[PDB]
Structures are given as structure tokens and as C-alpha cells.
Short mmCIF file of all heavy atoms in Angstrom, two decimals:
data_model
loop_
_atom_site.label_atom_id
_atom_site.label_comp_id
_atom_site.label_asym_id
_atom_site.label_seq_id
_atom_site.Cartn_x
_atom_site.Cartn_y
_atom_site.Cartn_z
N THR A 84 0.31 3.74 6.33
CA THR A 84 0.82 3.51 7.65
C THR A 84 1.84 4.58 7.87
O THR A 84 2.22 5.38 6.97
CB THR A 84 1.65 2.16 7.76
OG1 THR A 84 2.74 2.20 6.93
CG2 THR A 84 0.80 0.97 7.39
N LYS A 85 2.33 4.59 9.09
CA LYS A 85 3.52 5.31 9.53
C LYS A 85 4.69 4.78 8.84
O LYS A 85 4.69 3.65 8.32
CB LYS A 85 3.51 5.23 10.95
CG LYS A 85 4.62 5.97 11.78
CD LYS A 85 4.54 5.78 13.29
CE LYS A 85 4.01 4.38 13.55
NZ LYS A 85 4.16 4.07 15.01
N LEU A 86 5.80 5.45 8.80
CA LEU A 86 7.11 4.92 8.50
C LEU A 86 7.65 4.18 9.75
O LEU A 86 7.62 4.71 10.83
CB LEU A 86 8.06 6.05 8.10
CG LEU A 86 9.30 5.49 7.30
CD1 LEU A 86 8.99 5.37 5.84
CD2 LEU A 86 10.54 6.39 7.65
N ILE A 87 8.00 2.93 9.56
CA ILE A 87 8.56 2.20 10.66
C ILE A 87 10.03 1.75 10.45
O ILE A 87 10.48 1.73 9.23
CB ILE A 87 7.73 0.96 10.98
CG1 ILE A 87 7.74 -0.05 9.83
CG2 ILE A 87 6.33 1.39 11.29
CD1 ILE A 87 6.91 -1.24 10.10
N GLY A 88 10.66 1.28 11.46
CA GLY A 88 12.10 0.77 11.33
C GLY A 88 12.13 -0.59 11.92
O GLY A 88 11.08 -1.12 12.33
N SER A 89 13.27 -1.14 11.88
CA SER A 89 13.46 -2.44 12.54
C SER A 89 12.96 -2.27 13.95
O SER A 89 13.31 -1.40 14.62
CB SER A 89 14.93 -2.90 12.54
OG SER A 89 15.05 -4.20 13.01
N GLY A 90 12.11 -3.19 14.40
CA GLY A 90 11.55 -3.08 15.71
C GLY A 90 10.33 -2.21 15.90
O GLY A 90 9.59 -2.36 16.85
N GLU A 91 10.11 -1.22 14.97
CA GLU A 91 8.91 -0.33 15.02
C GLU A 91 7.85 -1.07 14.20
O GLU A 91 8.14 -1.59 13.15
CB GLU A 91 9.22 1.07 14.58
N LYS A 92 6.59 -0.94 14.65
CA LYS A 92 5.55 -1.69 13.94
C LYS A 92 4.20 -0.85 13.90
O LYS A 92 3.93 -0.04 14.75
CB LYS A 92 5.28 -3.04 14.55
CG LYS A 92 6.54 -3.89 14.60
CD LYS A 92 7.26 -4.02 13.28
CE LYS A 92 8.72 -4.18 13.42
NZ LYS A 92 9.01 -5.68 13.50
N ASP A 93 3.35 -1.17 12.84
CA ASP A 93 2.11 -0.39 12.71
C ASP A 93 1.07 -1.15 11.83
O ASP A 93 1.38 -2.01 11.06
CB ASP A 93 2.46 1.02 12.04
CG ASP A 93 1.25 1.95 12.13
OD1 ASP A 93 0.51 1.97 13.22
OD2 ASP A 93 1.16 2.80 11.20
N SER A 94 -0.18 -0.65 11.98
CA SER A 94 -1.23 -1.24 11.27
C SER A 94 -2.13 -0.09 10.70
O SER A 94 -2.10 1.01 11.24
CB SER A 94 -2.14 -2.10 12.14
OG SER A 94 -1.46 -3.18 12.64
N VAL A 95 -2.78 -0.40 9.64
CA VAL A 95 -3.82 0.61 9.05
C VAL A 95 -5.04 -0.15 8.65
O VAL A 95 -5.04 -1.16 8.08
CB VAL A 95 -3.25 1.29 7.83
CG1 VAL A 95 -2.94 0.35 6.69
CG2 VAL A 95 -4.24 2.33 7.32
N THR A 96 -6.19 0.41 8.94
CA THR A 96 -7.52 -0.12 8.54
C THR A 96 -8.16 0.88 7.72
O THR A 96 -8.20 2.12 8.07
CB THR A 96 -8.34 -0.41 9.83
OG1 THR A 96 -7.75 -1.39 10.66
CG2 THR A 96 -9.71 -1.07 9.39
N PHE A 97 -8.78 0.50 6.60
CA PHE A 97 -9.50 1.35 5.71
C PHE A 97 -10.80 0.78 5.19
O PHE A 97 -11.01 -0.40 5.43
CB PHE A 97 -8.59 1.76 4.48
CG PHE A 97 -8.27 0.61 3.57
CD1 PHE A 97 -9.02 0.43 2.49
CD2 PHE A 97 -7.20 -0.22 3.82
CE1 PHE A 97 -8.69 -0.64 1.59
CE2 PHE A 97 -6.82 -1.22 3.02
CZ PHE A 97 -7.60 -1.47 1.84
N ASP A 98 -11.65 1.62 4.68
CA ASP A 98 -12.94 1.26 4.23
C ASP A 98 -12.88 0.63 2.80
O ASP A 98 -12.43 1.22 1.88
CB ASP A 98 -13.84 2.51 4.17
CG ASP A 98 -14.19 3.02 5.50
OD1 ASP A 98 -14.31 2.14 6.50
OD2 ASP A 98 -14.43 4.19 5.68
N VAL A 99 -13.35 -0.61 2.65
CA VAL A 99 -13.27 -1.41 1.45
C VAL A 99 -14.20 -0.70 0.40
O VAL A 99 -13.94 -0.86 -0.88
CB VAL A 99 -13.84 -2.81 1.68
CG1 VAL A 99 -14.09 -3.50 0.38
CG2 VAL A 99 -12.88 -3.59 2.53
N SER A 100 -15.16 0.15 0.71
CA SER A 100 -15.93 0.82 -0.17
C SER A 100 -15.09 1.87 -0.94
O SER A 100 -15.55 2.41 -2.04
CB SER A 100 -16.95 1.62 0.56
OG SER A 100 -16.43 2.55 1.44
N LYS A 101 -13.85 2.12 -0.54
CA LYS A 101 -13.00 3.05 -1.17
C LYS A 101 -12.43 2.44 -2.46
O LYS A 101 -11.90 3.13 -3.20
CB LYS A 101 -11.92 3.47 -0.18
CG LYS A 101 -12.42 4.62 0.73
CD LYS A 101 -11.34 5.06 1.75
CE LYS A 101 -11.66 6.36 2.29
NZ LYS A 101 -10.74 6.63 3.46
N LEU A 102 -12.48 1.19 -2.57
CA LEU A 102 -11.95 0.40 -3.77
C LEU A 102 -13.00 0.34 -4.91
O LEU A 102 -13.91 -0.43 -4.81
CB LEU A 102 -11.52 -0.91 -3.39
CG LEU A 102 -10.45 -0.98 -2.23
CD1 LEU A 102 -10.29 -2.41 -1.74
CD2 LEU A 102 -9.15 -0.40 -2.69
N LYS A 103 -12.86 1.33 -5.79
CA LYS A 103 -13.82 1.41 -6.83
C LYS A 103 -13.61 0.55 -8.10
O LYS A 103 -12.42 0.09 -8.30
CB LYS A 103 -13.87 2.88 -7.24
CG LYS A 103 -14.91 3.31 -8.18
CD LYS A 103 -14.81 4.72 -8.53
CE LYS A 103 -15.09 4.94 -10.09
NZ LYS A 103 -14.06 4.27 -10.86
N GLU A 104 -14.65 0.26 -8.81
CA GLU A 104 -14.54 -0.74 -9.91
C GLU A 104 -13.82 -0.07 -11.10
O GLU A 104 -13.94 1.05 -11.36
CB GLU A 104 -16.01 -1.15 -10.28
N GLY A 105 -13.10 -1.02 -11.89
CA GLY A 105 -12.40 -0.47 -13.04
C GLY A 105 -11.04 0.10 -12.69
O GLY A 105 -10.21 0.49 -13.58
N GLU A 106 -10.82 0.34 -11.39
CA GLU A 106 -9.68 0.95 -10.87
C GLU A 106 -8.59 -0.13 -10.54
O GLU A 106 -8.96 -1.23 -10.09
CB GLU A 106 -10.06 1.70 -9.59
CG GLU A 106 -9.39 3.00 -9.34
CD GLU A 106 -9.97 3.72 -8.05
OE1 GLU A 106 -10.88 3.15 -7.46
OE2 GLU A 106 -9.52 4.79 -7.68
N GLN A 107 -7.30 0.07 -10.86
CA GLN A 107 -6.23 -0.80 -10.45
C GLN A 107 -5.48 -0.16 -9.31
O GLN A 107 -5.13 1.01 -9.44
CB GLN A 107 -5.33 -1.22 -11.55
CG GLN A 107 -4.48 -0.11 -12.18
CD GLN A 107 -3.32 -0.73 -12.99
OE1 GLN A 107 -2.46 -1.39 -12.46
NE2 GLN A 107 -3.38 -0.42 -14.35
N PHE A 108 -5.30 -0.89 -8.31
CA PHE A 108 -4.61 -0.39 -7.07
C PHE A 108 -3.17 -1.00 -6.84
O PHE A 108 -3.03 -2.15 -7.09
CB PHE A 108 -5.44 -0.66 -5.87
CG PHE A 108 -6.85 -0.21 -5.93
CD1 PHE A 108 -7.88 -1.19 -6.34
CD2 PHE A 108 -7.25 1.08 -5.71
CE1 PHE A 108 -9.21 -0.72 -6.50
CE2 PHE A 108 -8.59 1.47 -5.85
CZ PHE A 108 -9.57 0.52 -6.20
N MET A 109 -2.28 -0.10 -6.43
CA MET A 109 -0.99 -0.59 -6.04
C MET A 109 -0.63 -0.16 -4.67
O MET A 109 -1.07 0.89 -4.15
CB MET A 109 0.07 -0.01 -7.13
CG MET A 109 -0.10 -0.71 -8.46
SD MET A 109 1.17 -0.14 -9.56
CE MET A 109 2.59 -1.04 -8.83
N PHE A 110 0.20 -1.03 -3.92
CA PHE A 110 0.68 -0.62 -2.66
C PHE A 110 2.18 -0.51 -2.71
O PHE A 110 2.85 -1.19 -3.64
CB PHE A 110 0.31 -1.60 -1.57
CG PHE A 110 0.90 -2.91 -1.67
CD1 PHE A 110 2.09 -3.21 -1.11
CD2 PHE A 110 0.31 -3.98 -2.42
CE1 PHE A 110 2.74 -4.47 -1.21
CE2 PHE A 110 0.87 -5.19 -2.50
CZ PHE A 110 2.17 -5.47 -1.89
N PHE A 111 2.77 0.40 -1.91
CA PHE A 111 4.22 0.65 -2.12
C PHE A 111 4.75 1.40 -0.90
O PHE A 111 3.95 1.88 0.03
CB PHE A 111 4.37 1.43 -3.41
CG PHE A 111 3.48 2.59 -3.54
CD1 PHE A 111 3.92 3.87 -3.06
CD2 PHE A 111 2.22 2.51 -4.06
CE1 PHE A 111 3.04 4.99 -3.24
CE2 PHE A 111 1.36 3.64 -4.17
CZ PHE A 111 1.81 4.80 -3.70
N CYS A 112 6.03 1.51 -0.82
CA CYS A 112 6.78 2.28 0.13
C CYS A 112 7.28 3.64 -0.43
O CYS A 112 7.78 3.64 -1.60
CB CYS A 112 7.98 1.55 0.70
SG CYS A 112 8.85 2.50 1.93
N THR A 113 7.18 4.72 0.26
CA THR A 113 7.49 6.02 -0.32
C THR A 113 8.82 6.49 0.32
O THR A 113 9.15 7.72 0.09
CB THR A 113 6.45 7.10 -0.01
OG1 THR A 113 6.28 7.26 1.44
CG2 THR A 113 5.18 6.79 -0.67
N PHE A 114 9.55 5.69 1.10
CA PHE A 114 10.92 6.14 1.49
C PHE A 114 11.69 6.35 0.24
O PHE A 114 11.55 5.47 -0.70
CB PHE A 114 11.51 5.04 2.41
CG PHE A 114 12.79 5.42 3.00
CD1 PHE A 114 12.91 5.72 4.41
CD2 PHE A 114 13.90 5.44 2.27
CE1 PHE A 114 14.09 6.08 4.91
CE2 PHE A 114 15.20 5.79 2.83
CZ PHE A 114 15.25 6.18 4.18
N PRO A 115 12.49 7.39 0.15
CA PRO A 115 13.12 7.83 -1.10
C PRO A 115 13.77 6.68 -1.82
O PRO A 115 14.65 6.02 -1.27
CB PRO A 115 13.99 8.94 -0.69
CG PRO A 115 13.16 9.67 0.31
CD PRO A 115 12.68 8.52 1.17
N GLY A 116 13.45 6.39 -3.05
CA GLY A 116 14.02 5.43 -3.89
C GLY A 116 13.47 4.04 -3.77
O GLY A 116 13.69 3.17 -4.61
N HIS A 117 12.74 3.81 -2.70
CA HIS A 117 12.33 2.41 -2.43
C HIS A 117 11.28 1.88 -3.34
O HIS A 117 11.31 0.62 -3.57
CB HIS A 117 11.80 2.35 -0.92
CG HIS A 117 12.86 2.28 0.15
ND1 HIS A 117 12.50 1.86 1.42
CD2 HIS A 117 14.18 2.51 0.06
CE1 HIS A 117 13.66 1.86 2.20
NE2 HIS A 117 14.70 2.21 1.36
N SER A 118 10.46 2.72 -3.92
CA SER A 118 9.39 2.34 -4.72
C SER A 118 9.81 1.50 -6.00
O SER A 118 9.11 0.79 -6.53
CB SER A 118 8.51 3.52 -5.15
OG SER A 118 9.14 4.26 -6.17
N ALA A 119 11.11 1.69 -6.35
CA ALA A 119 11.71 0.94 -7.41
C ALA A 119 11.66 -0.61 -7.20
O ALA A 119 11.57 -1.37 -8.13
CB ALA A 119 13.19 1.37 -7.62
N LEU A 120 11.68 -1.04 -5.95
CA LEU A 120 11.57 -2.45 -5.58
C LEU A 120 10.41 -2.79 -4.65
O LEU A 120 9.99 -3.95 -4.65
CB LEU A 120 12.85 -2.83 -4.81
CG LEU A 120 14.09 -2.59 -5.60
CD1 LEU A 120 15.31 -2.70 -4.74
CD2 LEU A 120 14.21 -3.74 -6.66
N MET A 121 9.89 -1.74 -4.05
CA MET A 121 8.87 -2.04 -3.06
C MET A 121 7.48 -1.57 -3.46
O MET A 121 7.05 -0.49 -3.13
CB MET A 121 9.25 -1.42 -1.71
CG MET A 121 10.63 -1.90 -1.18
SD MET A 121 10.95 -1.38 0.57
CE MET A 121 9.71 -2.34 1.38
N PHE A 122 6.89 -2.47 -4.23
CA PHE A 122 5.60 -2.17 -4.76
C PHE A 122 4.87 -3.44 -5.12
O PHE A 122 5.53 -4.47 -5.30
CB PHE A 122 5.65 -1.31 -6.03
CG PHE A 122 6.33 -2.13 -7.14
CD1 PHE A 122 5.46 -2.56 -8.15
CD2 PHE A 122 7.61 -2.47 -7.14
CE1 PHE A 122 6.13 -3.28 -9.22
CE2 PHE A 122 8.18 -3.22 -8.08
CZ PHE A 122 7.47 -3.57 -9.14
N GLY A 123 3.58 -3.41 -5.11
CA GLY A 123 2.78 -4.58 -5.50
C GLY A 123 1.31 -4.16 -5.77
O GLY A 123 1.01 -2.98 -5.95
N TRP A 124 0.46 -5.14 -5.95
CA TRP A 124 -0.97 -4.96 -6.38
C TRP A 124 -1.91 -5.42 -5.35
O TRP A 124 -1.65 -6.36 -4.54
CB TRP A 124 -1.12 -5.70 -7.67
CG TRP A 124 -0.40 -5.09 -8.74
CD1 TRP A 124 -0.80 -4.23 -9.71
CD2 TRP A 124 0.97 -5.39 -9.07
NE1 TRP A 124 0.21 -3.87 -10.58
CE2 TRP A 124 1.32 -4.63 -10.27
CE3 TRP A 124 1.90 -6.27 -8.54
CZ2 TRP A 124 2.56 -4.72 -10.88
CZ3 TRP A 124 3.21 -6.31 -9.12
CH2 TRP A 124 3.54 -5.55 -10.27
N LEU A 125 -3.02 -4.69 -5.22
CA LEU A 125 -4.12 -5.03 -4.32
C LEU A 125 -5.42 -5.04 -5.13
O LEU A 125 -5.66 -4.08 -5.96
CB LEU A 125 -4.17 -4.10 -3.14
CG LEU A 125 -5.22 -4.28 -1.98
CD1 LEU A 125 -4.76 -3.60 -0.66
CD2 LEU A 125 -6.46 -3.80 -2.44
N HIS A 126 -6.20 -6.07 -4.93
CA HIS A 126 -7.45 -6.14 -5.64
C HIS A 126 -8.47 -6.83 -4.87
O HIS A 126 -8.18 -7.56 -3.88
CB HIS A 126 -7.25 -6.81 -6.99
CG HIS A 126 -6.89 -8.19 -6.91
ND1 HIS A 126 -7.91 -9.20 -6.92
CD2 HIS A 126 -5.62 -8.87 -7.01
CE1 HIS A 126 -7.30 -10.41 -6.89
NE2 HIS A 126 -5.98 -10.21 -6.97
N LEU A 127 -9.81 -6.63 -5.22
CA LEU A 127 -10.95 -7.28 -4.68
C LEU A 127 -11.18 -8.76 -5.09
O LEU A 127 -10.81 -9.12 -6.21
CB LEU A 127 -12.23 -6.47 -5.06
CG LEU A 127 -12.30 -5.13 -4.49
CD1 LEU A 127 -13.49 -4.32 -5.08
CD2 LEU A 127 -12.40 -5.14 -3.06
N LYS A 128 -11.70 -9.59 -4.18
CA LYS A 128 -11.96 -11.01 -4.44
C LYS A 128 -13.45 -11.34 -4.10
O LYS A 128 -14.12 -10.65 -3.22
CB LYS A 128 -11.03 -11.88 -3.66
#
């Protein structure tokens, strides 16, 4: 997504085919230093 602030908002749509098998995915924020606390996991169901 874009970088947003309080009051700013955004969405992202992507192709599920991009999620390959045996791969582990993480989502996170890249604002400097944030990734230390702002991260998690995404996986197929």
C-alpha cells in the first residue's frame, strides 16, 4: 500500500497465484524502525 497517516486510508489487491508453495510470507510496515513491532504472517487456507 501507500504510506498513510491518521485519517489517510488505502487498499491493495493482489493475485493469490503470487503466493507460492513452501514459501513463508510476512507483512510489515517499512516506515523507519517500525518493522521491529509492525510485522506478521500471511498464509493460504
